[PDB]
Amino acid sequence: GFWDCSVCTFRNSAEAFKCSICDVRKGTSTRKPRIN
Amino acid sequence: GKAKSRSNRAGLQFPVGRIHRLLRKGNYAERVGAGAPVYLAAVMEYLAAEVLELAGNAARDNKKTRIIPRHLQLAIRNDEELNKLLSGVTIAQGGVLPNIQAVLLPKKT
Amino acid sequence: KAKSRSNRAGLQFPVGRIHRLLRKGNYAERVGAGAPVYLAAVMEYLAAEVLELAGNAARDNKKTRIIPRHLQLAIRNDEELNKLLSGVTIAQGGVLPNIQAVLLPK
Amino acid sequence: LRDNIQGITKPAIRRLARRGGVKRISGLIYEETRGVLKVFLENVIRDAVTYTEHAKRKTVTAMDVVYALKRQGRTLYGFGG
Amino acid sequence: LRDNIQGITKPAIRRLARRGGVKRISGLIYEETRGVLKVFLENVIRDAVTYTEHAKRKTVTAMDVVYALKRQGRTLYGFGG
Amino acid sequence: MQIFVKTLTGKTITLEVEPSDTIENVKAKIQDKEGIPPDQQRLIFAGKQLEDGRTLSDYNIQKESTLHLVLRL
Amino acid sequence: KRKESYAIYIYKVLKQVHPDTGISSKAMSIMNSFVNDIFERIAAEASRLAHYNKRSTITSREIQTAVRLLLPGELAKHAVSEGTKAVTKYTSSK
Amino acid sequence: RKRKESYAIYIYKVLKQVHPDTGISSKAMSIMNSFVNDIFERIAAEASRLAHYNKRSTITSREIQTAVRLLLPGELAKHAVSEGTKAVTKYTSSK
Amino acid sequence: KKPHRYRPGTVALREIRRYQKSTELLIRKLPFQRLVREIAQDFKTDLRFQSSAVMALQEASEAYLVGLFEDTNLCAIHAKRVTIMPKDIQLARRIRGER
Amino acid sequence: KKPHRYRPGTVALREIRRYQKSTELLIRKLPFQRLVREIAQDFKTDLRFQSSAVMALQEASEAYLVGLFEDTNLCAIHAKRVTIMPKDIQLARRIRGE
DNA sequence: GGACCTGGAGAATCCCGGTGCCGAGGCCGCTCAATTGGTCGTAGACAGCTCTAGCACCGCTTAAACGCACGTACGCGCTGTCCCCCGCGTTTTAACCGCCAAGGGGATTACTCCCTAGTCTCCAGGCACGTGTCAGATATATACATCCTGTGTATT
DNA sequence: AATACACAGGATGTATATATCTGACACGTGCCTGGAGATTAGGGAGTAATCCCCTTGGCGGTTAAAACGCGGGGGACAGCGCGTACGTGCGTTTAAGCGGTGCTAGAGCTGTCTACGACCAATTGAGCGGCCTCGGCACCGGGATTCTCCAGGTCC
Ligand SMILES: [Zn+2]
């Protein structure tokens, strides 16, 4: 599995809890991460 | 037939009947409707689920299984709306976020 | 052959009206006997204090009536009243005369 | 109804500054004050209009404005309630 | 119980300032911090003992302190309520 | 070939490239326009991090492509 | 459509303290709002005290403790004295 | 020995439903309990005031909805309103 | 010959005393009404307003702005200046808690 | 020959990081408890305190002090400085509304 | 010669294993609070009507907003000095952990009875209209009060 | 010979007195809804009595933290020079504001009538308190890597 990021658009590993590129924290199922 | 608790009927986990009793005996109005405890239970369940999910993801990063106050503190202060809702709350044994002003830092390229 | 409770308590503020407001205001299942009397007395004292100060302010200003400016002056110049009313704004009240020392030519 | 924020003219902002006790004013204060006023009004009017919507009414009254201000720590005296 | 306000020692105030993010501290900060802490404690303990006396008790509980802080605008999570 | 670089700042930088061109030249063009060295440049497209040793055609990049730039220091 | 307010009582208190002084309509509205605010604050604090203490009755002791918790310094002392005097006068007369 | 109710088991059930393999400490559970209590009391007080303003004697789902729309920030309020509407609709259409 | 010319500072102090002595609305009423209608237009269409509501909005807004300018002046004086700049407003609003 | 000596301003940053990552109590418990008992003496004679009461008081007081120091640091940086002085504390307490 | 650059030494923090204690977690028994079923009154929805007051438009004064010119005072950058605070060391000091002992007071139970909710009857206090005088706003004319520029002349 | 400084005079601005005239406040009148008085009755709260949990006072030892002293460097604060960006004032330009008239949407009330919530009694399962373990997490120890800092080489 994986989880896409709403900021960097880069797919992140399923067992990862932040983007390894844009450092944006993993978002909740309902509310997505902000611009920054 | 068999009794069916209202919480199971509404598809919730929080106690609909207990919230109904608290509304009834809490000096809020003369009467309390039927759907008011259901709506209130849904709202509280959602607001607790969001915090618990973020705190779980925060705890797994720290290579820990047990949730502590620090994870809750970090999750609340890093979120914007959650911080806005809880702006006048102090969490015991939560600490503070890491933050140092740029002018105090040493010379950087 | 009926005597109002306000007259018996020695008060100018109503007592039965405040008892009704407490009873219908969703504050408890019961309302005692002396609670409206105590509440009315406290409210009357506070109003009397504010009115005395404002009336003194207006008279010294060569007026007969009381305007919101006098209320604002009396409220903001008293430390206890300012603390009690730290979150309230008065319409058409103005502000106290205050200017910083370093802004004056000397 | 467009760009009506510009109706708050520079002399008015200078007048409001004078009542606060200010002597010298920079040439970039006016935009900041306009932004602050716009955000404040957005908050209060949002609260007032949702109070009006719950009452099943099509008119914003003074009581709705006072109630909106009261739930923000900005109690107002002199318009009833 | 004669003079224990001095028990809040200089290293403790320095540590609290460090957690606050302060790099350099002047030598006159300690008296100011002591006074501010004394005033805050006076207010909260006055409210707590008022609640304690009303309930006809002789022991100040955790709920008294939580309620005293709640009325003052600083709610506390992690002790009940 | 026209490509837009949607940097996380919010700027849509536009550059001209060639379908068989290497990623290194595309990176160098940004340094020509902005000044960000290719070492510090990170390109994101369809969840794939491009490498200077490959080419645009190797990543199935078509016309009117949109790219993202991330600074990693 | 009989609306009601505290106007006549405030006027009577004013004439009690200052015999030859008037009051404008907007000052009247401000004093009305002040009275309503004081009433609601003290009532809410008394209700909270009753709920905390596991009781369902608001008495004069609840109001006294609410006034102490809400008014600062000399205001609280004078209000407590006034309330005690009013209650002890109301009780002695049947 | 005397009963003292709380929200512990429901918090734990929601946690297990979201994170199957994560526990909670005692202080964290107490903090979550206080959070739920605070939210309940806030919304109930707002609904009470808003019902009293319009000279009404009962508080219903509409008052709770308006209180939620008043007390929460944007996205949180929207999602909570959606959740409440769905829960009430499911509750009604079942006997 | 040369017309009388006050030095920079006297007219500002004169205006400070004047507007600290009076209690009238300082923003023209009709432009503020139009701004109020503009802002509310994005929350409900064909809304209508009572005049007293507009007056209450204006009173509260002016009180808030005067308080904010007072805090800005205090912050400017702290930084050893006489003028007010946007960073002073930002510091006051950051310390207050509005951001 | 010269023993190692850090330049001024480096141990301070280390302390800042160390105390910004921990969540313990920075004041000794016994002196703070004695201070609490002294302050409460002026209101009622022969009072008694639950341990949770003293702990809650200490946690709240430390949170308040940390927030005050944060605001003080902002005020000091505003005036083009690095060192905090009582003027900054007073300005912070004036703007906050205390 | 001085500034840019580097190398080596040293202290601090992080990663990796290994051991041990107690707090989270699931179970068991009970008991009381949620649930089901039925009855009864009224709060609230819905329709109909009246009439205030909110909106739109026009037309004319006229104070306020606007644009431009000129100069001065204040914001900002740079430089130099000195004393205060930081970092490290050595010697005190009292916080902290551990046990033991005593009793004040929170917590609960049972009993009695006074106080408040609810009801009906009666009537007067408090509110809505209507009316009229005078406090305050507005206009006009002197008269006192700070602000500014220029100069005599005494000091240096 | 120079330069500051108090003084004198012009000049705006503000404070004071006087006439008038208009609308808002203060008072009277009538009536109708809401507070007062009497009577009933059920439960809330006071109060005595008991048990035992938790708070307070005491003593000993171990050792980390607080207290005192010293040397120096980075920062706070004063002083000076420049220049540009606001403040003041004048001559046009725009649009707010006052008064008036006309339209009708929507608040505000009144009258019906039914669905919905309160209240009570019985009964069954959800939820709480006490127990008993184990596995996560804390602590110790050791080495490995990261980050400062000054002593010399060399090039500009
Ligand atoms: Zn990302």
Numbering used by the authors:
A (entry chain K): 23 to 58
B (entry chain G): 11 to 119
C (entry chain C): 12 to 117
D (entry chain F), E (entry chain B): 22 to 102
F (entry chain M): 1 to 73
G (entry chain D): 29 to 122
H (entry chain H): 28 to 122
I (entry chain E): 36 to 134
Excerpt from the paper describing this PDB structure:
Monoubiquitination of histone H2A at lysine 119 (H2Aub1) is catalyzed by the RING1B subunit of the E3 ubiquitin ligase Polycomb Repressive Complex 1 (PRC1). In vPRC1, also called RYBP–PRC1, the RING1B C-terminal RAWUL domain is bound by the RING1B-interacting domain of RYBP or its paralogue YAF2, whereas in canonical PRC1, the RAWUL domain is associated with CBX proteins. We uncover that human RYBP–PRC1 binds unmodified nucleosomes via RING1B but H2Aub1-modified nucleosomes via RYBP. Here, single-particle cryo-electron microscopy (cryo-EM) uncovers that RYBP–PRC1 uses two different interfaces for contacting unmodified and H2Aub1-modified nucleosomes.
